Amino acid sequence: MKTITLYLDPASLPALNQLMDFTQNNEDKTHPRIFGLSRFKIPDNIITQYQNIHFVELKDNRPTEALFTILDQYPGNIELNIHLNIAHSVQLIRPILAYRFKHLDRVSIQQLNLYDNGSMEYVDLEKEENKDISAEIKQAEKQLSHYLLTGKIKFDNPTIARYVWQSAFPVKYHFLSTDYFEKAEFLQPLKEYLAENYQKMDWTAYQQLTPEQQAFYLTLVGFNDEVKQSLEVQQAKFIFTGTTTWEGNTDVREYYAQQQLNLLNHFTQAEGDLFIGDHYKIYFKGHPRGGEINDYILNNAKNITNIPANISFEVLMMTGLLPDKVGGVASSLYFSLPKEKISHIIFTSNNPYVKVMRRLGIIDESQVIFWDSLKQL
Numbered sequence: 001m002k003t004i005t006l007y008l009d010p011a012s013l014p015a016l017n018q019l020m021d022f023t024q025n026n027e028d029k030t031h032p033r034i035f036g037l038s039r040f041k042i043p044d045n046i047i048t049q050y051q052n053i054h055f056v057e058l059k060d061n062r063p064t065e066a067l068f069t070i071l072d073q074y075p076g077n078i079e080l081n082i083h084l085n086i087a088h089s090v091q092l093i094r095p096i097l098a099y100r101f102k103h104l105d106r107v108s109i110q111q112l113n114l115y116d117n118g119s120m121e122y123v124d125l126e127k128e129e130n131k132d133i134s135a136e137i138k139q140a141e142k143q144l145s146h147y148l149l150t151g152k153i154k155f156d157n158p159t160i161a162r163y164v165w166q167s168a169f170p171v172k173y174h175f176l177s178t179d180y181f182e183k184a185e186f187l188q189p190l191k192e193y194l195a196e197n198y199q200k201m202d203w204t205a206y207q208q209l210t211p212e213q214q215a216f217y218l219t220l221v222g223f224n225d226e227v228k229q230s231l232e233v234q235q236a237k238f239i240f241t242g243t244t245t246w247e248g249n250t251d252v253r254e255y256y257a258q259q260q261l262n263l264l265n266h267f268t269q270a271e272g273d274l275f276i277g278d279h280y281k282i283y284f285k286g287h288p289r290g291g292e293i294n295d296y297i298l299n300n301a302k303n304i305t306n307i308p309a310n311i312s313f314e315v316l317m318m319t320g321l322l323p324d325k326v327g328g329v330a331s332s333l334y335f336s337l338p339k340e341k342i343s344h345i346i347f348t349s350n351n352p353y354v355k356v357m358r359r360l361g362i363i364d365e366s367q368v369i370f371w372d373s374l375k376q377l
């Protein structure tokens, strides 16, 4: 019998966690691996060192039918070690479960490892504040059973359904915020139900790698020597962090780009509401999917040092290269940032994201700043 490891994520944070998993397990050159990480391209000089290494496109938050061609190459008993984005877990596993239906005698699910998309899960859970969570859990388990038995998806509570995987498989959840599950009292039945099936995302993992693995990991995440040297300058630093919109609406993307540029000006200009001081070196950490929103900043700002957008902010924490101050639009990156490094967090326009951050003490009780409430400088 054979284990096949699948690394699946259309987003950013779960993929970053999974690249660490790959690094920790990188000595085994023959272990079958299937990478479905949309935002990441494993360098060819790494692929070359591995056999039984496979790549699958994601479409509509699920591996395409090309997954089946890969799995067909392993005609014996196979156990699937699946790494998943939590918010998209139901769709991402969908084709794996379809394949299993057709190959009942040889395909099993060994275990799930699940990682937060990021703030998304917490914003979603916040919207469930007024529900009987204990009862939502039981209904979600029942409906998960219907899914596993019929292949059909129908959840009364899609959000709670994300957390009932243990009723079917050995699972481990990796949470951006374990504090949220403790502090949100309405969620106490969920914390109790999840028992010993969860842990916090471990940001000390990198410090524990061998020098060789640390180098390997940095290559995976794109943290090159040029970027490292730019952050090793001996001057106090501010990193302005970008956001993106999922709206494939051009007018919305253009509005975001404009508001974000104006927000940067509020941090960096002396007359800005959020003025940080003249002594800072200014950096830009665009959102991985900002695209033309990122370009807008670089084309329209000055005296700013770009940090390549696909480099996850959290890599700076691992490498001990965090700046003095960080500011920009509310982001998953702010959940693991030391409090002393927050300049200001700004929201796009009872806001559940605001509520999430307030519950966690990431922001205080003062009036939140939305970016449409900032004067155009």
Ligand SMILES: Nc1ccn([C@@H]2O[C@H](COP(=O)(O)O)[C@@H](O)[C@H]2O)c(=O)n1
Residues within 6 Å of the ligand: 012, 013, 016, 117, 118, 119, 120, 241, 242, 243, 285, 286, 287, 288, 309, 310, 311, 312, 313, 314, 330, 331, 332, 333
């Ligand atoms: N400016 C940004 C925004 C996001 N990100 C990465 O993408 C993830 C999800 O962030 P968002 O919640 O902003 O979509 C983060 O945890 C961070 O790794 C980044 O590296 N730089």
